[PDB]
Amino acid sequence: TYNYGEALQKSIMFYEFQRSGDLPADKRDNWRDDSGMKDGSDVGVDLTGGWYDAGDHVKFNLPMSYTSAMLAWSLYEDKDAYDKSGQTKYIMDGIKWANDYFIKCNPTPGVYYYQVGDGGKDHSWWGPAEVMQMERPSFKVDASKPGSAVCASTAASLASAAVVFKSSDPTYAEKCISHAKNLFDMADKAKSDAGYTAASGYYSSSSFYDDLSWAAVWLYLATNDSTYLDKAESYVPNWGKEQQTDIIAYKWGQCWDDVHYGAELLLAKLTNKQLYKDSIEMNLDFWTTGVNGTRVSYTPKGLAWLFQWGSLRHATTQAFLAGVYAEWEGCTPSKVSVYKDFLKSQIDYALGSTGRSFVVGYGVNPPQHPHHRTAHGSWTDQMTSPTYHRHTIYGALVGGPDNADGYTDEINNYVNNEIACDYNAGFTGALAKMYKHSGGDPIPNFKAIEKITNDEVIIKAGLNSTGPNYTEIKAVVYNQTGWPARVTDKISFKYFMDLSEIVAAGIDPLSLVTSSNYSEGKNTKVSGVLPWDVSNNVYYVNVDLTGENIYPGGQSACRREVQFRIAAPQGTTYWNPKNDFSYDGLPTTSTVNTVTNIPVYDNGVKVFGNEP
Amino acid sequence: GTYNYGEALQKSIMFYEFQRSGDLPADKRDNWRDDSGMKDGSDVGVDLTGGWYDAGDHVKFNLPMSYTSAMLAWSLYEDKDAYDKSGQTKYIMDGIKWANDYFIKCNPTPGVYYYQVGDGGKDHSWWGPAEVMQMERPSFKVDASKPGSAVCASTAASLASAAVVFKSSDPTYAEKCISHAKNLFDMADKAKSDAGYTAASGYYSSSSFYDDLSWAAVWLYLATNDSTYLDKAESYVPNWGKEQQTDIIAYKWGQCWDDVHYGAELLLAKLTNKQLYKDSIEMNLDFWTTGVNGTRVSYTPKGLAWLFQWGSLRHATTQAFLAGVYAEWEGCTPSKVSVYKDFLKSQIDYALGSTGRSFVVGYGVNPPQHPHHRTAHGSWTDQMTSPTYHRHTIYGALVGGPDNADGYTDEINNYVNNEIACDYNAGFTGALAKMYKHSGGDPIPNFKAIEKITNDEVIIKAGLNSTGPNYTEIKAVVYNQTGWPARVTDKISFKYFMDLSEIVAAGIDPLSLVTSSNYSEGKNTKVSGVLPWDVSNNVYYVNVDLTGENIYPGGQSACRREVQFRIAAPQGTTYWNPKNDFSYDGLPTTSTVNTVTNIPVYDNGVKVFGNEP
């Protein structure tokens, strides 16, 4: 027995944590903030927004548009489930988030930016989205350098968004259609992926006629112009055949690189032509009862297993298509129960039928180490530290087990433990169907405002050098921010002393010499002695780090060391560090430890430690 | 700072030798502990002598006692190289054998197990050394009708772990240990109840037995290589305590006498490599170090991982041991190895001296001087306040420890922070063995605890009680202040010397003078007539014999005997002269007795205090 409503709620929420750009004031978390704010600056176009692809920060438009098209398809099929669960606003905000970005990516007729970020450079750094420091180049396709698959996948997303938004926001629906029409025209004129090269190694395209059909079907549903339905059907002979036959491929499943499964399902419902009915049932039969002596492999515990990478992604996506098709009056009657049983068995495997959940922050023993940079929240550019994720990325469906149900919840296992937009796409639609059928209430007013689990900015210190007339401190400030991760360019700290002995010597405490033999950072400034509470002879040295680009993204990047000394005159012996507030407990060597008596300030406001 | 881990290890093992009850070996390396609890088990007609006293008291509580020896054996099983290198292997094996020989005695027939000797109330109502305890020490047992699963299983774990470490050098003993371990484990397993475990209520109540069952089963598997036991160990896991609002195995406490699931799951991870156990032990170790999912054990400002008010050092050093063992296993998450090893060192260093003082008795800088311990203190008057210092150094004892703000006071009745106990040193010993392996520190060669005797053991105080023209009457009080070892002194006598030249000169027989006693405290006190000492020089004496008197260092009245005696010249005469009498010189003239050195005291005829003419 599983709570499908809560699963649906979290699956939709997952996308909110993948958001790039200027985040809404109404966001329900305290650990994601503005990021990729300069996206498109290299080309002079505002390309901010959209979703980060997986556990990384590249914006790959092919799987991104596949995702939003699939979410819109679910809303088109099961609006009643979203309304009943109270999740309609959230899934529509997600669909609009992706589509607003695709619109920005088509700034002028005939031009389409299909990517922001370099796979290699982006993947070479392990840290939060908010503090990325590397270049994020924009890439585009046009008539001279075509991208049929990505243009058509984007048109499908835009057109499907138009279908589900038309009732409540007819103007946005028209806006989506205008851009879908342009991108489809680009894809249809070109019939080539030759200029779609920036995603090589990550989302290279192996087919585009499937995307042309899928986009044409959605443009037909969005505009009711039969010109599109005729085009949709015209590409069918060009879809890849099953190896060793002259039959439309049926041994794989709906995914970001192959959408002919969804296109044929939709063409079956729209035309009732036997060709489409036979094709989709051949695929669904292969995945369930088996067909013509062949069948997708099943793990011992009941998972329809298609491939090593994202096994759950494949199974839950096929579950969604099986659910949609089983509801159609044209489905072979005897297969309705078979397909519906399949939808339930596969979704249940993801939610907990093996004894544990494969959905982050949901169910029994959910994964705790998904391969995801921002949810982990390292501040040292290390997958290994901290040894636990600082944030809970609710709703994320992990890759999944191997062919024998084997699974290792480790952060470095990106084959079976990464999470991604496309992984949750079909999954979300299958969950909506299970919810409408078996229920399970979503958590009321669900938010992801987390407790701060570690001091965000800390200071470590130790006695570096000492003498009869001086004290020399080694201090290191650390940015361990996570709610949200952020640059701390206004940090300072204060070192307090009791100078009663200086006053007793007839010496002005303000005349003591302060100095610094070493400091990381160009802006580090150590002040002279300043009064704090002279009635109790308390003075201090202010160490200002304002201007320093301290950020949680590397061992050096997150810290600033400062060695400073305060000294009475040469030959004197009255200097007494033992009555100094900041000296108490201070480590006796240059081995530094966290101290609570050399307070840290952020723009003058105390955030760590204590004052006298 | 740098700490000598080998010396710490050698002393921590030695601590248990000072906790020994029973017929002590002739090989003992101290001069202040001796035979005690020699009638243990007499109330039931079973030899239950031996084993270790629990803490600063003399009750034998088998649950923490067996937890202790099981933990020592675990350390020897994990780090035999450390014991061999430090030359401590023999000493730790003798300790493990001491406990286990007693547990064997406690399982005299299959199906019966004596789990305690001593009544908490009777034992704690007297403050004195083990050797002279006078109270009844009842024995308590569990059986099928009145079960004790936790104590039977903890004892089985001890016996099975002993077998594992003794198999190579003494297979016959290992075989005997296994036989008893199997019976105690079977009793525990079949009963699954602590209903009959009642005599330790308030001291060592059991809050769980499924943990003990897995712990015992794991050790029986290691001792026998019979997978039947591994299957059993794993079967109790679903019944182990869980974290409050989850279905996750408990992880917010630590390994201790009442909860051994931490040690059991750590060993199960190493023996099976199952993710469940790895996850479980790492959640516990993470809670104790870096924290896990917004939760971490409290830490004092000076670095001590602080779990609870009682035995804060006990808990921290035990977790240090587990961290050290786990960190060395190939299965440990690579990125946590250094965190765990750092923790092992930081906690042990806190115990040894990182705050500026040591929390280990007789070790390092400014060690505790007043641990809550009857025998080490050595009162001879049933007073926690007297003497005002400890007469003995109980080397190696780890005190309870500071509060959560590093506060600590070294006082005898700071029974919380200054308590010392078997379980407090168990995990600690294992952690020290790991640190010695990692960083060395040379133990003291052939270290012994032969103490200098710091107070005269049997003394006499005297004063003038009455005087007249023909007599001297003395008030004398003999005191047993024995401590090396505390002991009954039933053969004490003393001699009062006089010069009777004036009696002889007056023409009176000196051997005819009337001697008498107007008051004697004991029924066996005998005052002789005048006897010759050196007749040539007119020196004579009176012998006062206290032989038969059960004088012992365990109370104000118990440790002393007052005797008043008088020697008289003939009635009406005035030539008696006490001023030329050796024993009269400097004698307190009032009656308020003061220690004197001219009325020599003898023990079985041998002078032990004072001087002869």
Ligand SMILES: OC[C@H]1O[C@@H](O[C@H]2[C@H](O)[C@@H](O)[C@@H](O)O[C@@H]2CO)[C@H](O)[C@@H](O)[C@@H]1O
């Ligand atoms: O492309 C596969 C996954 O790579 C992940 O980044 C790796 C990178 O590929 C390695 O070469 C190396 O740099 O370590 C990185 C971190 O594991 C990337 O984070 C995933 O999103 C990719 O799917």
Ligand SMILES: OC[C@H]1O[C@H](O)[C@H](O)[C@@H](O)[C@@H]1O
């Ligand atoms: O911690 C393991 C590794 O994780 C990521 O790949 C980081 O980019 C790399 O710097 C680190 O060494």
Ligand SMILES: [Ca+2]
């Ligand atoms: Ca394609």
Ligand SMILES: [Ca+2]
């Ligand atoms: Ca000062």
Ligand SMILES: [Ca+2]
């Ligand atoms: Ca227990």
Ligand SMILES: [Ca+2]
């Ligand atoms: Ca005389």
Ligand SMILES: [Mg+2]
């Ligand atoms: Mg804003």
Ligand SMILES: [Mg+2]
């Ligand atoms: Mg990838």
Ligand SMILES: [Mg+2]
């Ligand atoms: Mg002051």
Ligand SMILES: [Mg+2]
């Ligand atoms: Mg003997």
